[model samples]
Structure formats: C-alpha cells, structure tokens
Target: ERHYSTGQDRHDFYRFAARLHVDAQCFGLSIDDLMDKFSDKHFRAEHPEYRDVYPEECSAIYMHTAQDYSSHLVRGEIGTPLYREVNNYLRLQHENSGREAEIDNHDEKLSPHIKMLSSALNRLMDVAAFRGTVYRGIRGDLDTIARLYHLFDTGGRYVEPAFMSTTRIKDSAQVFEPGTPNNIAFQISLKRGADISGSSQAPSEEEIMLPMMSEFVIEHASALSEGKHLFVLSQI
Candidate 1:
C-alpha cells in the first residue's frame, strides 16, 4: 500500500524485503553491491530505523527458510505487486542486456545463485497464475484478471496477503498441517469496521468466521468446476 517511486525508494523497498528473506539481487542489483550501498554511513545513519528493523543476518542470501506467518502476512500485504513487477522487469532486462553469455560464464559458486534467481523469477510467474486463477474463478472474469495481473507486473501496489501469502501458499499451509495437500484455506475475517491491525481479538470475536470462509472457498471452487451456483448455508 506504500508508494515507491524512485530507484532509491526501490532500495528502501528491498531493505524491508531483505528482512523478509527475499534476495536484493532479484531487483536486478548484485547482493554484495546492495549490502555495501546499504552499509554506507549516509544510508545507515539516515535510516537508523530501517537498519534496526532489518535482521542482523542480512546478507546476499538468508539461510533461514523457516516460515513465519505474521511476517508472511505483512509481506503479502505489501510486496505482491513488487514481486510481480520486479520479476517482469528482470525478464525484460535479461532480454535487453544480452546477459545469457555472461550468465553462462559465471563461476560455479554463482551458478547455484543464478539457478536460485531463475527459480525466484518463476515463483513470481506462479503468483501471477495463482491470482489470475483465483480472480478468474471468483467472478468468471479472466480478461479483467489478466489485465490486472499485467498491470501489477508493470509496477503497482503489491498489497497484502498476496505479496507474502500468495508466493508461499504451499509452504505456509504445510506449516499448519504437515504433509497435507495445502488445499484448505487460511482465512482472516472482520466485521465491517473492525480493527485487524495486530489484534488477537478479531479471531476470538469472529469464531464463526474461520469455518464460514472455508465453506465459501470450497463452495466457490465447486461452483467454478460444476458451472452451477449452489447455496448451502447451514445453522450450526
């Protein structure tokens, strides 16, 4: 929901991103270069809060793959569009830069990183696909969904839930139910004007919501697959 309009803003953007375990090089800059730039006296001193907020293990790559829901929720709330846009721009950059030869010649140590970055790019595409599928299924609105997906690719709001949650749905679901299909829903519901900002009360207050949402998604999926609207609200 925050607006980032400049390369410096993008840098600030990735400072937060590095905290979330995404690599800065995904933004088309080398991770070492990013760290050095971030470590500069002016950059560090000017943004002491950012420096403080960033994890101490900040580096070219974070070793921790352990999933965190609150962090994932926050990232999803902020970086979904950034993930899409950055990956698209990287694709364009690769095409224009003629960098395949350079990539082919990279050292062995970097080969893993190169592969990793490539996987990151595909992950963004998967996000686009997943959202597109969801949006399309939601309203039978594939054209509009496709357009919005591309617009997000062209730089736009990387809003919540999608930013963090969409990228790692399988990984996250497994955290909740190990070895399961990750097919179920993780729903957050609020009454029309409720405060959801880090308040545990929302879930406690909306005890009926979790099951209601799962039913909604399941019903939505069924409607889409069967091409029929079926209402089955029950009094429990």
Candidate 2:
C-alpha cells in the first residue's frame, strides 16, 4: 500500500522492502562490531595472511576506523605526520587545476592577469589615501574625507561613489579648473565578479564604480594638492 499510488505493488515492493529492512538493521550495530566485520571480510579479501600482517595494518586501520566515527566521539591521533600528509595532498590538488591538457597552464596564464589587477587596485587605494590627506590638509573640514570613508568601508554593503568636482577661486579673478600636466588616463579592466575564468565584458550601470571612482579620486587629489600649495604660499 505504501509503495503504490493505487492499491498495488509497483516494482517488487515486498522483496525491496525486506532488503531495505535488513540493511537498516546493520546501522544499529556497534562501532566495534563494524570494525570486526571490516577486518574479517574486507581486509581478508586483499590480504589473505591477515593475522600474520595485522600488526603492519594497525595504524592505517585505526586511522580509517577513527575517521568513520565522529571526531568528537572518537579522538584520533592527528599528529605532525598526518598534518604534513594532508597539507601536501591539498597543495598538490591546488597546483593541479584539473583542467584539460589542451587548455593553457593556469599559473602561466593567470600570473600577468593577477599582477595587472593588483597594480590597478593598489593605485586606487593610494589615490583614495591621497584624496583623504589632501582634503583634510586643505579645508580642515573632514566632510569630504568622511564621504570617501563611507565608499571604502568594509561593510559588505555597496556604497555608491560620491565624486565631487571643485572649482578654485584664486585672487577673486582667475578660476583654476582641475588640470594635470601628465594628461594620462588611468584605465582598469576588472572582471564583473571574482571569476577569473569568466568573460571580459565591460561593466554595466548596476556594477560597482571602482575604476571610474578611482579615476575621479585621483583627479580630485591632484587638484586639491595644487590648491594646498597655493594656499600655503599665499598665507606665507
């Protein structure tokens, strides 16, 4: 009845049910009984002279048995040798990308990509720092710096960049617009997400304004620094 939508067995229900019940009973066996069964049946299949070679298998068997039991229930000897072996295994797994043989080598392809991204992000951070210092130094009002702080805060929440444009009124006659002698454009091309293996598509409006915002900050910093020098000299 339980195995059928109507009141008939679908596929050998009685026989399957009986087999499942037998299998379920095995789960009720103690760890010691399970260990004994494994050693008597499974171990003997590979090693016929099991009793003679039992001592040699002791460590491997013990390790496997302890792992089968929960760590909290069974405290296994996890010493330096086991730690080293696990570390080496993990390192090997990481080094082996498990990609196709025809595919380009991961490290060889990824090294330059990593370096480029790092350089761009590093420059952005330096630009941010410069903006904060120059703003605070010039105006002594931390409002601009406070806004920049919100943009860079590590809250895991996306904060939109509030790039401000400033006009400098010098001697009430000449207005100095932000201009750089370098005339260089700082361009950064980053993946949408951390998926290095993903597409090289340009950012959408919804995407975080990291590259554009950094450029804005860099430009503003230059202007502020130039203004600061003028203000200091005028005061002197």
Candidate 3:
C-alpha cells in the first residue's frame, strides 16, 4: 500500500534536500561546477560514498549532508515528490534575498533541484537494484490498452511516470480486482535496474521500485482467455 517511506521520513527527506541547497549556496558553488571539480578519483578521495553513486550523483553535497540511515539504506529512503516542484522556488529566492522566505510556502528552493532530486532517486535505484526482471501492476481499457499495444508494436519505449513501484512476485501484482478487460499486469526485464525487495522500505509487500526517468521497451503484448492482457517489457 506504500511506495517506500514512513510518514516522518518524508519531511526528513525535505530537510536533507534543503541542507544540500543551503550548503551549496554557502560555498557559492553551483551544482554543475562543484560536480566538475570533484570528478573521478579526487571525488572518491574526498567523498567515500562515491562508489555506489554515479558521477553526476556523486557530490560535495554528500560532504555537507549527514546520512543517518543505516548502511542498508545508504542511498536514503524512498524517492518522492514535493521534490518535483522546483520551478516555484526560483522566484522566491529572487524575491527574498534579504528577508527570510515565508515558510508558509517556503518550498521555493525545492523547485530548482533537478539534479539533486534526480541524482538522489536515480543513484538510489542503482544500488538497490543493479539489474533484474520484475513485475508491475497495470490496468487499461480496451481502447487505451489497444493504444499501448500499438505504441509498443511500433517500437515505442514506454517512459515511466515520476517513479514506478513494481514487485518480484507475479501474484502480488493485483492492479485491479475483479477480472475484466481493464485488469492486466506488466513484467519487465531491466537492463539498467529496478530496486530489490530487501532494499524496499516496505519489503513486506516484496516491492521493487523503478528509478526516476526510467524507460522501457515493450517486448510482448498478448491477451488472456479471460479477456485481460499481458505486457512483457525490457529496460533499454
């Protein structure tokens, strides 16, 4: 029933992101420039956590931000939104250079962290699952499913939504109950990766979540005798 987070953990995540922006600003370092200076081996030497992280995700930001999650949750908790609203923050900063920005709508900086939010979730996906085959719940109408079938058949790469939560067990994928043309599921073999069950915050569901900006290649689309459909995909 959950994605990958407990209640308090979501706000704690906001603080972590805020600290990243605050610290980066303190040193007068733009994310891009700081990233450039700490490229490769020097990055490794300066920040020990760079091993599992991608170079873009690798950062001096790690040096400033304290990670309290155990070694198991190294990349931190679930990838989430509220992190998605960066556009709004840009104007707040421009408007409030002197006075403190209003906490009532203080999420201005959050809107600008394309790389921070993106890097965090994506790198989290890298370690949680290197690569694997997994299942996801999918439901579509006759016409909508038909469009999806057409998309795949014509070599369309299905782009993921914000992030996708999938599972390891086929039976666990109950996208919609009561069999109809609308109920079906998708199975994907990831060349890049999907999160592992144990890595999931809600592992009881045996959940495996896909990464930010994840995309897939639709491999097979077939209808069942019960009048449902199945889609097998490959992550490209």
Candidate 4:
C-alpha cells in the first residue's frame, strides 16, 4: 500500500552518508591519522562508546581505504576506541543492536568501503579465518532472558544492529558480567566468524567481533553452578 511507519525516511540521509563515505575515500585521512584519532585522548574523552564495541573500526587494516574515510568513520561514527576493559561501560550500550538500519539499506548496494560501520567491519574482517567457539557477555534479567529464550525456543533465530564483542578466552566473558542476576554469558559455537583481536585495545582478550546483524540460532540455555547464566548459540 506504499505506507510508512515511524514517519521517517532514511533514503535522503543514507544517501548523504554514503556519498560522504565516497568523498572520504576520494580524499585522504591517512591511516596514521586515523589511528591517532582513535587513540587520541580528547576524542576518547568527549565521546566514548561505539568505538570500543566496534573496535575493528579503529584498526590500521583496510590499507586501501583513504584516511579520510578511516578518520571520518572513527571520529564521526564510532567514537571510543577500546583498550581492554579499562571501563567498557559502553559495552552495555552495544548490547543494543539493527533491523531498521538493515531494512532501509536493503535495496541499496553500497560499496563495502562506504556503506556503514557494519560493512566497514565485515570488510576488514576478511583477514580473519576463525572456526570453533567464541564468547560474549550481555546483561539480562530474568524477564529478558525468558524473552530471549522463548524466542530462541520457537525459531532460534536472532539479528541485531549492535555489534557483539566476543572473547577467545572464556574467562574474559566472565570479566564482562556485570555481577548481577541479569548477567548472561553467551558461548558461541561457530564454524566461521571474524577474529578482530588485532583491532582490540585489549588484544590479550583475543576478541572476536560479530558485525551488525550477525546471524545465529540458539541451541540451548542453562544456569552454571558458579552462579552464571549461559546460553549456547550456533552460528548460522
């Protein structure tokens, strides 16, 4: 019927951002400058969140990408560059994720270089060759876990706009737990996924980042004797 919800249209704005991405590619921001901004003290202070979660964006990867794009993506889009857990309070923010952003850009075939953070991450993730398991932590109350479990119980499918920071060290997952009843840890079994450990501030953590809208199906759930909730997810 050609109707719309939320009374918003992203086409115009999306076009602008995409073009800006292209313009950024055309100019030059220098990879050094890009990482400089990422590790920049002022940039981290004024704003700090998205960068840590999407730490891959803060990388010196994408050797071909102009500094303009890298700098803009880092400073303009994702703000805080992650460095271990110094205070990854923003990880909670990333626990939030993207269906609309996905839907809006569905029809457009934007170049991987200029699409968005999601594409940017997925593109850089090419260097990785991962298989087996990874870990990530999320805060979930009884009701939230119940809701997610119920959803998984039905179809076991999930997608998100937010990026998921997974750790290679199982214990690292525990570090992310907020030490609350709502603490939920995910043990992800994957055949293949991106390992962005090189991009993380805490490389010791060996982080495996799942890009926006990463797909998965839940296998099961249980409570640990150690007093933590665990969810098993098999990547699809």
TM-score for every candidate vs. truth? 0.20, 0.16, 0.50, 0.52
Candidate 3 residue 36 C-alpha distance from true site, Å: 32
lDDT of 4 by residue, 1-236 (tens): 11122212223323323333323334444434454655666654543432332212443222222123321335445322222211132222332223424334342332222233444345444544478898877766679778777867798586543456678887777734445433777889876665654444355777666554567888887776445677788887
Candidate 3 has a TM-score of 0.50
Show pairs that collide, candidate 4: 29-67, 29-68, 30-67, 84-202, 97-161, 97-162, 98-160, 98-161
lDDT (tens digit, per residue) of candidate 3 on 1-236: 11233234334444444344322213444335444654656655654444555433333123222222211221444222232223223323443321112222334444223334344445555455456777777666788788779987898888753445567777678643445333767887876554433222244566555444467888898876465777888887
> In model 2, which runs have C-alpha deviations exceeding 4 angstroms?
1-106, 129-206, 209-236
TM-score of 4: 0.52
lDDT of each: 0.28, 0.25, 0.49, 0.49
**Which window of ten consecutive residues has the lowest lDDT sum in model 4?**
1-10
Scored against the true structure, residue 204 in model 4 reaches a CA lDDT of 78
Prediction-by-prediction clash tally: 9, 0, 4, 8
* Candidate 3: worst-modelled 10 consecutive residues by lDDT: 65-74
Residues 1-236, model 1: lDDT tens digits:
11112344335434444444333324433334445654666754653433322211222122211122111334334333333443333344422322333433433322333323333323223222121111101222446445334443454332221112221222332323333333222322211111111111122221111100111111111121222222211111
Candidate 3: clashing pairs of residues: 85-111, 86-111, 86-112, 89-108
User: How does residue 178 of candidate 4 score in lDDT?
Assistant: 48
Query: Cα deviation in Å at residue 88, candidate 2?
Result: 21
- What's the true lDDT of residue 89 in model 1? 36
Error of 1 at 193 (Å): 26
